[PDB]
Design a protein around this ligand. Structure first.
Ligand SMILES: [Mg+2]
Ligand SMILES: [Mg+2]
Ligand SMILES: [Mg+2]
Ligand SMILES: [Mg+2]
Ligand SMILES: [Mg+2]
Ligand SMILES: [Mg+2]
Ligand SMILES: [Mg+2]
Ligand SMILES: [Mg+2]
Ligand SMILES: [Mg+2]
Ligand SMILES: [Mg+2]
Ligand SMILES: [Mg+2]
Ligand SMILES: [Mg+2]
Ligand SMILES: [Mg+2]
Ligand SMILES: [Zn+2]
Lengths: 107, 170, 52, 62, 190
RNA sequence: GGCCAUGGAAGUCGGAAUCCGCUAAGGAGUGUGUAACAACUCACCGGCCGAAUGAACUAGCCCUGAAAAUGGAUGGCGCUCA
């Protein structure tokens, strides 16, 4: 029974943050460590919320609920691959300063 | 070689009870002597009645409704093994309800060594919907545009010797 | 002395095995049954013991 | 024994648990110090911890 | 259960021409031709197009169905053998005694001659199968390259070399000496 | 590098513990590797494909269990959709 309840909490906190802020853009990563992700949210205390999860659940759990919050619809074809979310609202420059900040590279 | 019979019987009327309830069973038996025998066998498994205290009221053959319509049957079974008593459900393809039961008796003899005496037929149902078919060994014949060859045909010869090389095309 | 890269390559063939508990057979580590008919394809297996 | 300083240990080790809002750092010490086992308000932690974890008395310190 | 029909689809790349007649598969590619007889199996073949072939088993039981994807895989290995080749790399593993490996030719036959294996005075000779090429790697110390179109012959010659170097009467967990297959790939890297 | 044991043990010698915090994800750790770390691997969560999958049990035939002495007996030959 637990997974469906945890699924219920996921779609719950998904729509909770959706209305409370607004507007988000492309947010995909790869080869990103767990400590890597802890760094961004360490300085992004309240200004942004690192909404995280997966793909298939996020698509349909929002796609079916395109009634109380329609608008998106054709927005779903954007979500491909390893993509997270940084729930916030500031400006195109103001988020990339705080978000793009840490980079870990390799040959 | 079996037939399906409708057998109806009742307790012998008494001055206390002059019209006892009539009970019917559908019996798959080779003849009417075994049909009335199987009837009393199952009534004494369910009701306080005996052949000495009862009466057979009617025995009638139940013919197939559409004997040239291909159907899929589900048969619910209760059989005895060497160790215990088991419930089972199996499916058969045939055009008559009787011919599916005949296949069932051959089938439990071959895979479970269950003799005629060890089997109770709980229910025979014609599956109307394709979603009602649960078993794959009969579901594979309900696919669209089913074709298949019969490779390696062996022809039975009337003679002992044949003057030409054997073949198996077909 | 064998370099650690080659010692793992050699250990893949000599050490990384399971052993049948009844008839002593060298089986793949992931095997669930023994391949030999003499023991009845038993599931009673145990890893090949290592030097220590 | 907090002695009005268990937040100090959290705010002295202020660079640790990258949690939610400061009090999450306190829980890191709460969880890790339970592996010792002392006079933690009379018993072991993972209990008095788990009180305010759900919400016992009051530490929403700013 | 006697599955009524089971199918597998071969995929034929652009430059390859499979050719089947009476369960005798002849695969032709840029690298050459390979042939295989499958008369020990009851399978039928249908050419879907020049790039795909259907392989069918009709009314087959569990084991006879199991024998279908193996036919697919064998023909696919033939196809990739005549379009990419096969290459097995072997590393010489020894703790004390260096293994002296030479490619000799005696009686008109190619042989792999292993000397000094675990200090033995015995000279080991392994016949090189036809269609199999041996080479002593220059880029790697103690490396032998076994290459060829047929995967079966290449892997079996490699196995011959590995098997002739088994250790007896010792703790093989401790005495790890031998010649082992280190890389199984293709002539054309992908 | 949790505590204590330990020459040293940091998850991977051994004992109380088995928690917390971020997490969608992660055990005071499933292994290989180090004197010890490191290292990689796994536990679980991701991306990808996309329609099935896992577990326990029941009983039919077959197999293991199943070792004796002159050479030899489903009566013999032989029989494998028998
Ligand atoms: Mg997250
Ligand atoms: Mg009763
Ligand atoms: Mg009968
Ligand atoms: Mg049958
Ligand atoms: Mg059947
Ligand atoms: Mg009975
Ligand atoms: Mg004739
Ligand atoms: Mg010895
Ligand atoms: Mg069985
Ligand atoms: Mg067996
Ligand atoms: Mg036996
Ligand atoms: Mg005999
Ligand atoms: Mg016959
Ligand atoms: Zn065994």
């Amino acid at each position: 029974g637990g997974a469906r309840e945890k699924k219920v909490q996921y779609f719950s906190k998904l729509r909770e943050l959706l209305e409370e802020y607004k507007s988000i853009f492309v947010v995909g990563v790869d080869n990103v460590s767990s400590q890597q992700m802890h760094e961004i949210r360490k300085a992004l205390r309240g200004d942004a919320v690192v909404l995280m999860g997966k793909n298939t659940m996020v698509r349909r759990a929002i796609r079916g609920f395109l009634s109380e919050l329609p608008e998106f619809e054709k927005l779903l074809p954007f979500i491909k691959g390893n993509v997270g979310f940084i729930f916030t609202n500031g400006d195109l420059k103001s988020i990339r300063d705080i978000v793009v900040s840490n980079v870990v590279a390799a040959p | 070689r079996l037939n399906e019979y409708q057998v109806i019987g009742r307790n012998l009327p008494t001055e206390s009870v002059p019209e006892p309830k009539l009970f019917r069973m559908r019996i798959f038996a080779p003849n009417t002597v075994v049909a009335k025998s199987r009837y009393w066998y199952f009534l004494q498994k369910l009701h306080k009645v005996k052949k000495a205290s009862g009466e057979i009221v009617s025995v009638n053959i139940i013919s197939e409704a559409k004997p040239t319509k291909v159907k899929t049957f589900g048969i619910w079974l209760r059989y005895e093994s060497r160790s215990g008593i088991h419930n089972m459900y199996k499916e058969y393809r045939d055009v008559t309800r009787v011919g599916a039961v005949e296949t069932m008796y051959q089938d439990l003899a071959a895979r479970h060594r269950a003799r005629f005496r060890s089997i109770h037929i709980l229910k025979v149902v014609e599956l109307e919907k394709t979603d009602d078919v649960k078993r794959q060994y009969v579901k594979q014949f309900l696919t669209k545009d089913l074709k298949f060859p019969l490779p390696h045909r062996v022809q039975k010869s009337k003679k002992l010797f044949q003057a030409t090389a054997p073949t198996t095309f077909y | 002395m064998i370099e650690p890269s080659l010692k793992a390559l050699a250990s893949k063939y000599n050490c990384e095995k399971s052993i049948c508990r009844k008839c002593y057979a060298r089986l793949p580590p992931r095997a669930t049954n023994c391949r030999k008919r003499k023991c009845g394809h038993t599931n009673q297996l145990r890893p090949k013991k290592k030097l220590k | 024994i907090p002695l009005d300083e268990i937040f100090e240990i959290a705010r002295k080790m202020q660079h640790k648990s990258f949690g939610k809002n400061l009090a999450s750092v306190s829980k890191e010490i709460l969880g890790t110090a339970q592996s010792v086992g002392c006079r933690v308000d009379g018993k072991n932690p993972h209990d008095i911890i788990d009180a305010i974890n759900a919400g016992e008395i009051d530490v929403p310190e700013n | 259960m006697k599955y009524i029909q089971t199918d597998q689809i071969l995929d034929i790349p652009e430059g390859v021409t499979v050719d089947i007649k009476a369960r005798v598969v002849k695969v032709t590619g840029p690298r050459g031709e390979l042939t295989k007889d499958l008369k020990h199996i009851d399978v039928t073949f249908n050419k879907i197009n020049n790039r795909a072939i259907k392989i069918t088993v009709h009314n087959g039981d569990r084991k006879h169905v199991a024998a279908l994807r193996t036919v697919k895989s064998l023909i696919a290995n033939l196809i990739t053998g005549v379009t990419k080749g096969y290459k097995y790399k072997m590393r010489f593993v020894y703790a004390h005694f260096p293994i002296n490996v030479n490619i000799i030719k005696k009686d008109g036959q190619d042989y792999v001659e292993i000397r000094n294996f675990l200090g033995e005075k015995r000279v080991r000779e392994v016949k090189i199968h036809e269609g199999v090429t041996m080479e002593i790697s220059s880029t790697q110390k103690d490396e032998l390259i076994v290459s060829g179109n047929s995967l079966e012959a290449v892997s079996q010659n490699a196995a011959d070399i590995q098997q002739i170097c088994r250790v007896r009467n010792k703790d093989i967990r401790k005495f790890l000496d031998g010649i082992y297959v280190s890389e199984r790939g293709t002539i054309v890297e992908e």
